[PDB]
Design a protein around this ligand. Structure first.
Ligand SMILES: [Mg+2]
Ligand SMILES: [Mg+2]
Ligand SMILES: [Mg+2]
Ligand SMILES: [Mg+2]
Ligand SMILES: [Mg+2]
Ligand SMILES: [Mg+2]
Ligand SMILES: [Mg+2]
Ligand SMILES: [Mg+2]
Ligand SMILES: [Mg+2]
Ligand SMILES: [Mg+2]
Ligand SMILES: [Mg+2]
Ligand SMILES: [Mg+2]
Ligand SMILES: [Mg+2]
Ligand SMILES: [Mg+2]
Ligand SMILES: [Mg+2]
Ligand SMILES: [Mg+2]
Ligand SMILES: [Mg+2]
Ligand SMILES: [Mg+2]
Ligand SMILES: [Mg+2]
Ligand SMILES: [Mg+2]
Ligand SMILES: [Mg+2]
Ligand SMILES: [Mg+2]
Ligand SMILES: [Mg+2]
Ligand SMILES: [Mg+2]
Ligand SMILES: [Mg+2]
Ligand SMILES: [Mg+2]
Ligand SMILES: [Mg+2]
Ligand SMILES: [Mg+2]
Ligand SMILES: [Mg+2]
Ligand SMILES: [Mg+2]
Ligand SMILES: [Mg+2]
Ligand SMILES: [Mg+2]
Ligand SMILES: [Mg+2]
Ligand SMILES: [Mg+2]
Ligand SMILES: [Zn+2]
Lengths: 49, 101, 116, 53, 154, 111, 144
RNA sequence: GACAAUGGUAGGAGAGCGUUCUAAGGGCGUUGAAGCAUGAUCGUAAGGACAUGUGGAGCGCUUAGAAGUGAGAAUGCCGGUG
RNA sequence: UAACUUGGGAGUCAGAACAUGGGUGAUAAGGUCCGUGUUCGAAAGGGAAACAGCCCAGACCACCAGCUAAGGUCCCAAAAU
RNA sequence: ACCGAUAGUGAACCAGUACCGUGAGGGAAAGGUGAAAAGCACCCCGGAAGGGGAGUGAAAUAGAACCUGAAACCGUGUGCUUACAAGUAGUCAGAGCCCGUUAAUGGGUGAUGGCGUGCCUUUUGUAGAAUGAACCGGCGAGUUACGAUUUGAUGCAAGGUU
């Protein structure tokens, strides 16, 4: 293989999903949190269990 | 002299030497096309198809196979963070009517 | 590494503003209100492509009605007679014929009346 | 009370239609030929009504 | 971040009554000169793979050279003093491409010093072989002793 | 042929200067001069000096006949604004814009 | 393929007609006249231009109503002053201004657009049997 | 070739556009880079070219890698100007 | 033409009108609480003047082609004076 | 595979300065002529400022916070258009007039007709007379570390791995 023709194994890599970057992504605005309540807050959500 | 021809799910009133634009035909530029559905012939002698005038034909020369001017299809629903933008260029065939019948 | 805001913002907004050419005052000048107007323009154009087909059929029907009445026949009965005669000329073509050569339209009218 | 909506460039300029000044009421001094205010002494030559001031 | 930026202790103005947006410190992130939200923070990017995979990678790079015919075996480098011009002539006579990886069995001072200044020529030992160097090179020039040592190791 | 003169950063607001420029735009030079002399506004002497400078270069630099010249162009562009304040009641201060004008006059023989 | 004819001022021909109100019912005469004024009787009807004809209505004073409209049909108007409602019965208006009666009946059947106002200006109504427009050489027109 | 599906908020899934940096390869540039400006250009979208003017020295492209990677709204912060 | 099992990720826990079976209220409420259906919510298009919740009907894109639904056909306003 | 002048130190610059506070203390803004200063002799209008020439320079349209010079905003000129009209300002249809392009079944304007109550947020439902934004620009929000779990990938496999 050549350094200008590198290729990762098929299916080994996937681009990370980025929230809060516009409505078309489907994760803009509320960024997948829905609306309000404890779980919509930075650091929100109850203890596991 | 004019004829009513059916093509591309539409109808066109044509005279000889007239340029027409129709839905894409399966032909090449410079070919000769024959329209075989003539509903009506007007002018000196009138012929009324029921629905088509039997044996009547309109010949034409294929000038161009093009794509219509770009349409930007855009819609949205206010307050819903919901919209869609798409482009469209409708294919067309341009021909010149050579002979009626 | 840091990615500064750069040029993309201006390029994108300028495109919307150019699409707003000819609008009134601030609507051809300010990105926010131009964007809004261009959104409205797209929605209106989508709607009106469909409304245009309705409007032109309406125009053809009106003109055919006038021609039929000149031959002592209503639009409705003329279309019914043409149907029973088996004539498939559509309203656009009927209107253009009635406008462009009246003798041909009179022959169509007689065919309709005979069928009725 | 305060403006409920800003004033468009168009509306502002319509309002300013009549906001302007006029050319002074002036005529040529019959003595020295320079322009003067009608019914005023001519400042160039000091003359008025064919006499010096 | 907002803790790190200088100053910013006090509340810039009272919570209510002034008509302004409520604010808690002049160094909040939306403020010009404020603290950065997240952003880079020093860290290592190094990671490991299993040893067997390391060895397989090295063998794969060497096999790629062998199959591309970019493998040349030389009896020895008999350099007594460093001479870049002589090493350049040796490369030209061996008909080597621009990018050459020279492999000795052990550290060869005169070969290293003669090749060091030639653009595109890298020198290594059998123990020092690595995937990046092999892959970057167009051709490998390996002494017979070095080749035998590599063969033993892998 | 045209001759130009500019007075930059005149400490008069452009709205005010343009009131007077609108009187002389497109008129003959002598009539314009008289209009400026007999118009009672702050910008009249400043504009007059610009006009006289423009006529002077028409004569000296381009050997134009000054008695046939017309004010072809006259306009004021915005210069940089001096920012000031006025103390108002209850400890507040309110802005004062001391605006400036770039005044351009262009005279022409029409040829 | 777009082929629809569009009338315009270069090719529009407006004729003059005379219609006799005598013995005719207000509304029925009015609807027919409105069609004429709008050009709905022309094969070249084109919505954005006035393709209609001029109409003179004579003997407006002899227009007729059915039922008890003479005393019971009331025309209201408002002066835009408080309490400024004024009313007049259809019979009284027929007696005192039959021309206005017909004009308002017809103009209420035309669109409230710039074009509709223009088209309504092509109507001329007279209470008696005479009109002053012989110069336009109008033709008699038979209703229905 | 056929014929079937394709409204959509929270939300799940997928494929992509564009930004800065790095690696390797291959290129462009004072016979004028980036930036900016204009145009009647191209793509299904994000967006991509080309020409001309301005500008005056840097910049694409391909594959892969990495992120301070995309703003219209926070009585947001700073500046400029109404 | 679905269904079920296991595992990864969720959101939701303010609902509305209309019709109908009922409680409550006064066989009051655009009231309130349950049952059942639809629609809105998250649905544009045609009708109901205008009119989320009614009636018809579910927009992949293009056409200056055709047939219909609810509703309509004297003029506004397409179609029967 | 850190920043590149709203970033990076608060401070690229005479900054813990200016400024604010009785005091502890708080705390800015502000970089760029040109290769070379060759930094515009001389003439002209002006009291000066400022300008027009001339000259220096590749360039002054690089002339002193002097590389580039976007937008808001302000002006001058003009092709089309507008003083009987009810406008979320567009959209679809469309004469007339003026042009002539990345040459494409072109560009600008728009008499007149149809249709049509911004955007965001929040809501059962908002043209909403509920919330937010004067405008433009820049800046401004799921990150990283270490653990867990699951899926994909790859190596080896009763072994795997340090
Ligand atoms: Mg993705
Ligand atoms: Mg969603
Ligand atoms: Mg948003
Ligand atoms: Mg989620
Ligand atoms: Mg929210
Ligand atoms: Mg809630
Ligand atoms: Mg929740
Ligand atoms: Mg950078
Ligand atoms: Mg930004
Ligand atoms: Mg306020
Ligand atoms: Mg900082
Ligand atoms: Mg005080
Ligand atoms: Mg969908
Ligand atoms: Mg569907
Ligand atoms: Mg997802
Ligand atoms: Mg960011
Ligand atoms: Mg209720
Ligand atoms: Mg309730
Ligand atoms: Mg229920
Ligand atoms: Mg609906
Ligand atoms: Mg409706
Ligand atoms: Mg039918
Ligand atoms: Mg009709
Ligand atoms: Mg800068
Ligand atoms: Mg700083
Ligand atoms: Mg600072
Ligand atoms: Mg500059
Ligand atoms: Mg008028
Ligand atoms: Mg909701
Ligand atoms: Mg409420
Ligand atoms: Mg209001
Ligand atoms: Mg609130
Ligand atoms: Mg507000
Ligand atoms: Mg802003
Ligand atoms: Zn005198």
């Amino acid at each position: 293989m050549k350094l200008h023709e590198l290729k990762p194994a098929e299916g080994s890599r996937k681009e990370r999903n980025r929230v809060g970057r516009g409505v078309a992504t489907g994760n803009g605005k509320t960024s997948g949190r829905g609306h309000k309540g404890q779980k919509a807050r930075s650091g929100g959500g109850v203890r596991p269990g | 002299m004019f004829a009513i021809i059916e093509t591309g799910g539409k109808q066109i009133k044509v005279e000889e030497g007239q340029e027409i634009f129709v839905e894409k035909l399966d032909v090449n530029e410079g070919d000769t096309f024959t329209f075989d559905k003539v509903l009506f012939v007007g002018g000196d002698s009138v012929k009324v198809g029921a629905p088509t005038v039997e044996g009547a034909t309109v010949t034409a020369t294929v000038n161009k196979q093009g794509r219509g001017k770009k349409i930007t299809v855009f819609t949205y629903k206010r307050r819903k963070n919901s919209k869609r933008k798409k482009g469209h260029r409708q294919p067309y065939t341009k021909l010149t009517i050579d002979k009626i019948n | 590494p840091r990615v500064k805001g750069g040029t993309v913002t201006r390029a994108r907004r300028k495109k919307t503003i150019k699409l707003a050419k000819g609008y009134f005052g601030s609507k051809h000048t300010l990105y926010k209100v131009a964007k809004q107007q261009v959104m409205k323009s797209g929605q209106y154009a989508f709607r009106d492509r469909r409304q245009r087909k309705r409007d032109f059929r309406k125009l053809w029907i009106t003109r055919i009605n006038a021609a039929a009445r000149q031959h002592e026949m209503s639009y409705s009965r003329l279309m019914n007679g043409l149907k029973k005669a088996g004539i498939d000329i559509n309203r656009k073509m009927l209107s253009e014929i009635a406008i462009s050569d009246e003798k041909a339209f009179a022959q169509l009218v007689t065919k309709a009346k005979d069928a009725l | 009370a305060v403006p409920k909506r800003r004033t468009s460039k168009t509306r502002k300029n319509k309002r300013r239609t009549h906001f302007k000044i006029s050319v002074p009421g002036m005529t040529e001094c019959p003595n020295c030929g320079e322009y003067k205010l009608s019914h005023r002494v001519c400042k160039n030559c000091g003359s008025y009504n064919g006499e010096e001031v | 971040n907002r803790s790190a930026v200088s100053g910013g202790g006090r509340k810039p103005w009272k919570q209510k009554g002034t008509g302004r947006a409520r604010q808690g410190t002049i160094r909040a992130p939306q403020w010009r000169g404020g603290g950065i939200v997240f952003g880079p923070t020093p860290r290592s990017y190094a990671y490991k793979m299993p040893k067997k995979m390391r060895r397989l990678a090295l063998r794969s790079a060497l096999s790629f050279k062998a199959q591309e015919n970019g493998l040349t075996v030389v009896d020895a480098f008999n350099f007594e003093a460093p001479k870049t011009k002589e090493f350049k002539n040796v490369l030209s006579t061996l008909e080597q491409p621009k990018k050459v990886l020279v492999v000795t069995e052990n550290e060869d001072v005169n070969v290293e010093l003669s090749a060091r200044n030639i653009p595109g020529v890298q020198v290594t030992t059998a123990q020092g072989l690595n995937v990046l160097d092999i892959t970057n090179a167009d051709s490998l020039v390996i002494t017979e002793a070095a080749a035998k040592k590599v063969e033993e190791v892998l | 042929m045209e001759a130009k003169a500019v007075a930059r950063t005149i400490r008069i607001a452009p709205r005010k200067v343009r009131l007077v420029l609108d009187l002389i735009r497109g008129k003959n030079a002598a009539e314009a001069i008289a209009i400026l002399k007999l118009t009672n506004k702050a910008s009249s002497p400043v504009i007059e000096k610009v006009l006289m400078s423009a006529l002077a270069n028409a004569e000296h630099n381009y050997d134009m006949n000054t008695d046939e010249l017309v004010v072809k162009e006259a306009y004021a562009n915005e210069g940089p604004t001096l920012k000031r304040f006025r103390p108002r009641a209850q400890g507040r201060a309110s802005a004062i814009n001391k605006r400036t004008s770039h005044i351009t006059i262009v005279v022409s023989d029409g040829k | 393929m777009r082929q629809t004819f569009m009338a315009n001022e270069s090719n529009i021909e407006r004729k003059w007609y005379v219609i006799d109100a005598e013995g005719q019912t207000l509304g029925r005469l009015s609807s027919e006249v409105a069609s004429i004024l709008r050009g709905k009787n022309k094969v070249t009807y084109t919505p954005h231009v006035d393709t209609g004809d001029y109409v003179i209505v004579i003997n407006a004073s002899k227009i007729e109503f059915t039922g008890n409209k003479e005393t019971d049909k009331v025309y209201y108007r408002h002066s835009n002053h408080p309490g400024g409602i004024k009313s007049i019965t259809a019979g009284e208006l027929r007696r005192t201004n039959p021309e206005r009666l017909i004009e308002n009946s017809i103009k209420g059947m035309l669109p409230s657009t710039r074009l509709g106002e223009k088209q309504g200006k092509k109507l001329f109504v007279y209470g008696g049997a005479e009109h002053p427009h012989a110069a336009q050489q109008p033709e008699n027109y038979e209703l229905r």
